[PDB]
């Protein structure tokens, strides 16, 4: 197999990154170091038109947690966007 996600991230231009850096900021609005833990992520859901619980929110973080830390960062967060690039399944 290969890395269709880790490859796209590195192949991102300032046009895309400039967009991800936006949510990454509102995603950690109140964090201590600069990561996510649902407490900050869910805060956006209410505005996104939804509101997941703290027990399920972990799914949004465990979907890209390759470090076993629990919180997401510019590394795991970015991939979370490539996996949902466009819907065509």
């Amino acid at each position: 197999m290969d890395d269709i996600y880790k490859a796209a991230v590195e192949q991102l231009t300032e046009e895309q990154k400039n967009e991800f850096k936006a949510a990454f900021d509102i995603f950690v609005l109140g964090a201590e170091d600069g990561c996510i833990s649902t407490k900050e992520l869910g805060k956006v859901m209410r505005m996104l038109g939804q509101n997941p619980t703290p027990e399920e929110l972990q799914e949004m973080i465990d979907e890209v947690d390759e470090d076993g830390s629990g919180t997401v960062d510019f590394d795991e967060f970015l991939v979370m966007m490539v996996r949902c690039m466009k819907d065509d399944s």
Partner: peptide
């Protein structure tokens, strides 16, 4: 899976007087 359309429409840009 993060509502790409409802993502910017809700936050990251919502100034409307």
């Amino acid at each position: 899976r993060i509502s790409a359309d409802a993502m910017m429409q809700a936050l990251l840009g919502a100034r409307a007087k």
